[PDB]
Design a protein around this ligand. Sequence first.
Ligand SMILES: *[C@@H]1O[C@H](CO)[C@@H](O[C@@H]2O[C@H](CO)[C@@H](O[C@@H]3O[C@H](CO[C@H]4O[C@H](CO)[C@@H](O)[C@H](O)[C@@H]4O)[C@@H](O)[C@H](O[C@H]4O[C@H](CO[C@@H]5O[C@H](CO)[C@@H](O)[C@H](O)[C@@H]5O)[C@@H](O)[C@H](O)[C@@H]4O)[C@@H]3O)[C@H](O)[C@H]2NC(C)=O)[C@H](O)[C@H]1NC(C)=O
Ligand SMILES: CC[C@H](C)[C@H](NC(C)=O)C(=O)N[C@@H](Cc1ccc(O)cc1)C(=O)N[C@@H](Cc1ccc(O)cc1)P(=O)(O)O
Ligand SMILES: *[C@@H]1O[C@H](CO)[C@@H](O)[C@H](O)[C@H]1NC(C)=O
Ligand SMILES: *[C@@H]1O[C@H](CO)[C@@H](O)[C@H](O)[C@H]1NC(C)=O
Ligand SMILES: [Zn+2]
Length: 598
Amino acid sequence: ALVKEEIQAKEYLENLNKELAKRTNVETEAAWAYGSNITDENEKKKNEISAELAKFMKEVASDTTKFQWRSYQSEDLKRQFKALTKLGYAALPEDDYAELLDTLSAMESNFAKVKVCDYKDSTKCDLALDPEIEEVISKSRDHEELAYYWREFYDKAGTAVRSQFERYVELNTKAAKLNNFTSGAEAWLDEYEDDTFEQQLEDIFADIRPLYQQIHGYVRFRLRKHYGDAVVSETGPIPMHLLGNMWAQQWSEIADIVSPFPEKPLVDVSAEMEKQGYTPLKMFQMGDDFFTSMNLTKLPQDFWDKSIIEKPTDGRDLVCHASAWDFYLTDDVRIKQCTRVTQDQLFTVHHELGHIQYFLQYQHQPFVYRTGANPGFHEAVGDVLSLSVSTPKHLEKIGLLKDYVRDDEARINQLFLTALDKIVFLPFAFTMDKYRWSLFRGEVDKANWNCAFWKLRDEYSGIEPPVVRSEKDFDAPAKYHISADVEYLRYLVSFIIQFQFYKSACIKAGQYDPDNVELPLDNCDIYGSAAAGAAFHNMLSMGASKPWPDALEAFNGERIMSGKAIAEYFEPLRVWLEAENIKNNVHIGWTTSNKCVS
Ligand SMILES: *[C@@H]1O[C@H](CO)[C@@H](O[C@@H]2O[C@H](CO)[C@@H](O[C@@H]3O[C@H](CO[C@H]4O[C@H](CO)[C@@H](O)[C@H](O)[C@@H]4O)[C@@H](O)[C@H](O[C@H]4O[C@H](CO[C@@H]5O[C@H](CO)[C@@H](O)[C@H](O)[C@@H]5O)[C@@H](O)[C@H](O)[C@@H]4O)[C@@H]3O)[C@H](O)[C@H]2NC(C)=O)[C@H](O)[C@H]1NC(C)=O
Ligand SMILES: CC[C@H](C)[C@H](NC(C)=O)C(=O)N[C@@H](Cc1ccc(O)cc1)C(=O)N[C@@H](Cc1ccc(O)cc1)P(=O)(O)O
Ligand SMILES: *[C@@H]1O[C@H](CO)[C@@H](O)[C@H](O)[C@H]1NC(C)=O
Ligand SMILES: *[C@@H]1O[C@H](CO)[C@@H](O)[C@H](O)[C@H]1NC(C)=O
Ligand SMILES: [Zn+2]
């Protein structure tokens, strides 16, 4: 009978979940040791534990076929069993999985070990991306210096791993097909449990795209005034090295030269943070304070004891891209961040702590449910907090923003500053996965892989390399997530839904009313709000126990991913910017780039 089997299956699941948590703990520990301390010994250790867990997963997926799980009454049991059938890379034969792991660590370690020579001193060749190269990219307004560092980094972080990337694509595809997905694109998209998900994102992107064009047009206009027309053309794609970010994914670092009202205040609290003697420790303690202030969970002692919150000062190689870690026990959660005392880093701290909070909220769930409702939810949590921390309202409370007058012009500056991070990012994030999807799906011949990347960057973002590239170069892996095999659509989803969360959290906190001029969405602070915290607790505690629309419904009663909230936030900027571009006869749109030779 199926009644007796379903009872037996429940007990099978309870034990197996706990076993998976314990085995994953061991893998995570080895991955932590390697990430904190890159060596051949730690690489070998990390990959061997992974190979071992993969083998166990194979046995698990095989064992699910012994249960008539599709016949069960309990939606919960069926959901758990379905999650267990999904093997990912662990579906690969033993030798193929080991090869994939070796390729993956070859790419991640290459990225982490990149060092370039000083622009002014060909003798000093120990400049790493974080912090040395990024310091220049964010601060230099010498266009040739910027171009030098761009070329050096992309040559070393990108082109150097072409053959490894090729083999990774092959094995990623082989794995996907062994799970009966068409390609790795479909395997990734499966995490969103919605067969129209791509179309939904296309529709939302199409609605916000006109606002992006206006911001792009205005930024290009302002850059021409700064650099002159020899460096920036009116009608062409923006040379990306001028945008204050190695990947041009966010442009806030150049706000001081492109701000709507240069004579009015522009929020940049980095200097005040340094003046008040801020430390990484203080920044994390402040993040903790924000969460607990909303009646959410305090960081456990293991976090403080075991986290790495500063770049180590010995000679060691490590991964400095900020990350948050769930060790799948109780309260063993960690962050590794090479924290610097800057405004952007203060947001990053809150982003990472958002992951940590999610871990703590769902750690009581069975193992397979100890993850985000979808990957976008996990990325959105910290950013909702970061949105309110970024407000003049909050920054004045914590003494970081002084003598600030919030008039109509200062408001436009702040909205524009936010847009330089939030709207600009949308086409960037979309192209990261449109590119990899196209390779996974076999839609681009290997002969055309590099210019296929830049074609997308041109088409969607209207940016281009500072120098002519060709198929001799291979630029995609110069972005961390591409070298490290981390799906990127999560961030596009995050940047849309975080505004749904923020709007609703602000309304619940009595911080936003569309008919009250004193409560604008763009100055909402949710600090200290137990009502906003309740909504978070209701949603995050669910983990992946239910399909994501149910998790969204738990937060604010809605079930649909929508661009309404983000457009609402930026509406006063849209009205002003459209008018300003008309007033200044600003050219909108761009010609096709000449910077990638076929
Ligand atoms: C991805 O898709 C793949 C298909 O493209 C799929 O691979 C298939 O998985 C099937 C398992 O579900 C498997 O089916 C079995 O086939 C056996 C014989 O196949 C041979 O000949 C084929 C050519 O004709 C070759 O291609 C194969 O390589 C094989 O050499 C059968 O002997 C076997 O049967 C037994 O099992 C079924 C079990 O089914 C259920 O059993 C319960 C009993 O508790 C029933 O109550 C229930 O109703 C249901 O029937 C029994 O019914 C039966 O009595 C036998 O005991 C079985 O049909 C198939 O061979 C395999 N390949 C192909 C090419 O079809 C992958 O599994 C998919 N991967 C993932 C991850 O989902
Ligand atoms: C081997 C441990 C992993 C590093 C970790 N996974 C776990 C279970 O701790 C993990 O994927 N952490 C996510 C944040 C995250 C965590 C879990 C999720 O379900 C979703 C996101 C994280 O740190 N994401 C960062 C990017 C990243 C993502 C994956 C990595 O392996 C390394 C870095 P972020 O978006 O903050 O820049
Ligand atoms: C890094 O790992 C090596 C082994 O490869 C070990 O000897 C060393 O102690 C580690 N360094 C640190 C700082 O933990
Ligand atoms: C704190 O959370 C609890 C439940 O976790 C809730 O009942 C309570 O309302 C919250 N605190 C306050 C002051 O509301
Ligand atoms: Zn993240």
